[PDB]
Amino acid sequence: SYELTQDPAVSVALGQTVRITCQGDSLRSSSASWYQQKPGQAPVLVIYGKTNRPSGIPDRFSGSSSGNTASLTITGAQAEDEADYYCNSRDNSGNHPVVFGGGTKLTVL
Amino acid sequence: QVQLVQSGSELKKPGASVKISCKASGYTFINHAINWVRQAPGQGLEWMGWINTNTGNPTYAPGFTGRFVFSLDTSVSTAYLQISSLKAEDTAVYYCARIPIRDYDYDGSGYYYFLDYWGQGTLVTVS
Amino acid sequence: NITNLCPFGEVFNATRFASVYAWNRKRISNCVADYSVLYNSASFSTFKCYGVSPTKLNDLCFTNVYADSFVIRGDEVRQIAPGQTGKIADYNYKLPDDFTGCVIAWNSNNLDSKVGGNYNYLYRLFRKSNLKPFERDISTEIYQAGSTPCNGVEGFNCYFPLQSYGFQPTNGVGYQPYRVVVLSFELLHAPATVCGPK
Ligand SMILES: *[C@@H]1O[C@H](CO)[C@@H](O[C@@H]2O[C@H](CO)[C@@H](O[C@@H]3O[C@H](CO)[C@@H](O)[C@H](O)[C@@H]3O)[C@H](O)[C@H]2NC(C)=O)[C@H](O)[C@H]1NC(C)=O
Numbered sequence: 001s002y003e004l005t006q007d008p009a010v011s012v013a014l015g016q017t018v019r020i021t022c023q024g025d026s027l028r029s030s031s032a033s034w035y036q037q038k039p040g041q042a043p044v045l046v047i048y049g050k051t052n053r054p055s056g057i058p059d060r061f062s063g064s065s066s067g068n069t070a071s072l073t074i075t076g077a078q079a080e081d082e083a084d085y086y087c088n089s090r091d092n093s094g095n096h097p098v099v100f101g102g103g104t105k106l107t108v109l
Numbered sequence: 110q111v112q113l114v115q116s117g118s119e120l121k122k123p124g125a126s127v128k129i130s131c132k133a134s135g136y137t138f139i140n141h142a143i144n145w146v147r148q149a150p151g152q153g154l155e156w157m158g159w160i161n162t163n164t165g166n167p168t169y170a171p172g173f174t175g176r177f178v179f180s181l182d183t184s185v186s187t188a189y190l191q192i193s194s195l196k197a198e199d200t201a202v203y204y205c206a207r208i209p210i211r212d213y214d215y216d217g218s219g220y221y222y223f224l225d226y227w228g229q230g231t232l233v234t235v236s
Numbered sequence: 237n238i239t240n241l242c243p244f245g246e247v248f249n250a251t252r253f254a255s256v257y258a259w260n261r262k263r264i265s266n267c268v269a270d271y272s273v274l275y276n277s278a279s280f281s282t283f284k285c286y287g288v289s290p291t292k293l294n295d296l297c298f299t300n301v302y303a304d305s306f307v308i309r310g311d312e313v314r315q316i317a318p319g320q321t322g323k324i325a326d327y328n329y330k331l332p333d334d335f336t337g338c339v340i341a342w343n344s345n346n347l348d349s350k351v352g353g354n355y356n357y358l359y360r361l362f363r364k365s366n367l368k369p370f371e372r373d374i375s376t377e378i379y380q381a382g383s384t385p386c387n388g389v390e391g392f393n394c395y396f397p398l399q400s401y402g403f404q405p406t407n408g409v410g411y412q413p414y415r416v417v418v419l420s421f422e423l424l425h426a427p428a429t430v431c432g433p434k
Contacts, residue, residue: 033223042204042227049220054392086154090219096156096170097213098222100146103153111382136382137365163321209381209395215323215361217309217411218399225381225393 001026001093004101014079014109020072022087022101030090032070034063037084037103046085047072078108111135113207113228123235126193131205131228138162138186142213144206144224145179145190157203160188161212195235204230238433242267244274247303253415256328257360257398258374259306266429269301270294274340281414285338286318287421293338297428302337304329304418307348307357309401311410313341316418328360329418332369337420348413349403357413362397 004024012018022032032050037043045054047063050070062073070087087101115131133141145157158169160179167179176199178191188205206224210216242264254260271293275283288296308316308324315325318333325331348354362379379397380386386394403413 030219031222035224042229044227045223045225048223048225048392052392084153088223090222097159097168098144098156100154100156140363140365141381163326209393210361211326212322214312216399217402220399221395 001091001095002099004087004089004099006087006102006104008084008103008105010104011107011109016078018074018078018106018108020085020104020106022070022072024068024070024089024101026091027065027068027070027089030092032063032065032087032089034061034070034072035086035088036081037086039082039084043084043086081106081108111207111226113205113226115203115205115228115231118232118234121195121233121235123195123197125195126191127195127233129190129192129203129231129233130187131190131231132185132187133207134186136207139183140211142208142211143179143181143188144208146204146206146224147201148204148230149201159208159213162188163211192233195233197235200232200234202230202232204228239268242269242430244269244303247305247417248274250305254306255356255358256306256308256324257358258372259304259329261372262303262305264301264303264430268433269430270433272433280340280342282313282341283338284317287336287338290338294432297431298421298423299426299428299430300422300424301430302420302422304420306416307344308341308414308416309410310343310345310412310414313414313416316341316416323359323361327363327367328373330367330369330371331418331420335420336422337418339416339418341414341416343409343412344415345405345412349405349407351405354403354413355400357401357403358398359401360398362395 004022006022010020034047035043036046044056046061050063050065053061060075064071084103084105086103088098091099112135113131113133116129119127121127139162141162143160143162146154147157148154156170158167160167160181162181165181176194180189204227207226208224209221247262275290312324315322316339318331318335378386378388378394380394383393
C-alpha cells in the first residue's frame with residue numbers, strides 16, 4: 001500500500017531468458033503492469049494486464065502473476081535494454097489509488 | 110496519433126514558482142484523466158496526483174498541498190502545474206500521463222490502473 | 237372507493253434485477269399508488285425526493301409516472317441525482333438537471349454477492365462522448381482512444397466497454413450491492429390518473 005519492493009541488480013547472461021520479480025502484499029486481488037525507461041527518454045509501457053502485450057514491441061516481453069509475485073520476462077536480443085523497469089497496480093486502504101515500485105536497473109553486458 | 114508534449118527545461122531561483130505546461134493531441138482530451146509523476150536523478154518515480162478532466166478537483170497525495178497546484182485549459186486541451194515556494198530538494202524531471210479511464214474510481218476492476226502514454230518531461234532545476 | 241393498486245411490489249421485491257448499462261424501465265398506467273407504504277418502511281437506506289415534499293406525495297395527481305430500476309456499488313450511490321457525475325451519473329443513467337421524481341436505494345447484500353462472487357452485474361465505461369438525460373446505451377461498439385479504428389478487433393487501445401462488479405460476501409458497507417429504483421413523475425398534459433389513495 002506504500003511501496004512495491006524490487007531488486008536493482010539484474011544482469012545474468014546477455015544471451016538467455018531474463019526475469020524481473022516484484023513482491024507486493026497488495027497484489028493478490030488486483031492486477032499489475034510493467035513499463036520500461038531508457039535513460040532520460042520518455043518511458044512507455046511494455047505490458048498491461050500482466051498478459052496483454054502492447055502495440056509497441058510485443059516481441060520479446062512477457063508477464064505473469066503468481067500470488068503476491070509479478071514476473072516480467074525477456075527472451076532474446078537482450079541488448080538495447082540498458083534501462084529501468086517499473087511496476088504499477090491497484091491499491092486498497094483508500095490512501096493511494098496507484099503506487100510505483102522502486103524499479104529495477106536492467107543492465108546487460 | 111496520440112501525442113503528449115511538455116514544456117522545455119525551466120531554470121529558476123529557490124523560493125520562486127514554476128509553471129509547467131503539457132498538451133495532448135490526437136484524442137478526446139475530456140475523456141481521460143491527467144496523472145502527474147516526478148523523478149529525481151538516481152531515484153525512482155513517485156506518484157504526484159491526478160486531475161479529472163471534467164471538473165479539475167485534484168486528489169493530491171498526502172503532504173503535497175499548497176506547493177503544488179493543478180489546472181487545465183480545456184479550450185486548448187492543456188494541463189498546467191504550478192510549483193510555488195520551491196525548495197532546493199525539489200529539482201527533478203516531471204511527467205504528465207494519460208490513463209485509459211476518466212478517473213481512477215470509474216474502473217473498480219483494477220485492470221486499467223496504468224498510464225499509457227507519457228511526454229518527454231520537464232527538468233526543473235534551482236540553486 | 238378504494239380499488240386496485242400499482243405494481244410497486246413487482247418492481248421492488250422482484251427477482252434477478254436489471255443491471256445498470258441497460259437500466260430497466262416500467263410505465264405505470266392508470267392506477268392508484270400508495271407511496272406512504274414505501275415511506276413508512278424502514279428497510280430502505282436512502283429515500284430522497286427532489287420534486288415535491290415526500291410526506292404528501294399522496295395528494296398530487298400525475299399521468300405518466302415512470303419507474304427505473306438498476307443496481308449500483310454501495311458506496312457510489314449518491315451519484316443518482318441531478319448534476320452529479322461519475323461512472324453511474326455520466327455514462328449509464330443520468331437524471332435531467334430539471335427533475336421531479338424521488339430516488340430510493342436499499343442494501344441487498346444478502347440477496348447478492350454470493351460466496352464465489354456475483355460477477356454477473358455489468359456496468360458501462362468507455363463511452364465515446366457524454367450521455368444525454370434518460371438515455372439508454374445498450375450498444376456494444378468497441379471503444380478506442382484515437383490512434384486507428386479497430387473494426388471489431390479487441391486489443392491494446394481497443395477495449396470492451398463493459399465491466400463486471402466484484403461483489404463478495406464480506407466487502408464492507410462501501411463495496412456492497414445496492415438496489416436503486418428511481419420513481420420519476422410526469423405531467424405531460426392529458427388527464428391525470430395516478431392520484432392518491434383518497
Ligand atoms: C418486499 O418484501 C417485504 C417482505 O415480505 C415486504 O415487506 C413486508 O410487508 C408486510 C406487509 O406489506 C409487512 O407486514 C407487517 O409486518 C409488521 C412487522 O412489525 C407488522 O407490524 C404489520 O402489522 C404487518 O404484519 C412486513 O413486516 C414487511 N416486511 C419487511 C418490511 O421486512 C415489502 O412490502 C415487499 N415490497 C413491496 C411489496 O413492494
